[PDB]
Amino acid sequence: MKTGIHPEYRPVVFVDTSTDFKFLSGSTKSSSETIKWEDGNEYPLLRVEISSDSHPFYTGKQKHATADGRVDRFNKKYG
């Protein structure tokens, strides 16, 4: 580990604002925050968008949409 030629890599605690999903994995970005978790992990409380707990392929997303029947729609629309 050569010194003086690497960017800082202080630990950080992740938090998912979508569903309050705590996560711990150190990251390079400081993000200017402070929060301690899991018996002491004082580090930035890095906010983030949806994590793997809500994504379609990374989670159990059910529909988020609907389907079509066309001939069913033709029968429903026409009557």
In the chain, DSSP finds a helix count (H) and a strand count (E) of 1, 3
Binding mask 3-32 for other proteins (x = CB under 8 A): --xxx-x----x--------xxxxxxx---
Determine if 52 is a binding residue for other proteins (CB under 8 A).
yes
Q: Rounded CA gap, 31 and 48, in Å?
A: 11
Site size toward other proteins, by CB under 8 A = 23
Q: Map the footprint of RNA across residues 3-42, applying CB under 7 A.
A: 5-6
Q: Rounded CA gap, 66 and 41, in Å?
A: 43
Of the ranges 2-10, 28-36, 44-52, 58-66, which one interacts with RNA (CB under 7 A)?
Answer: 2-10
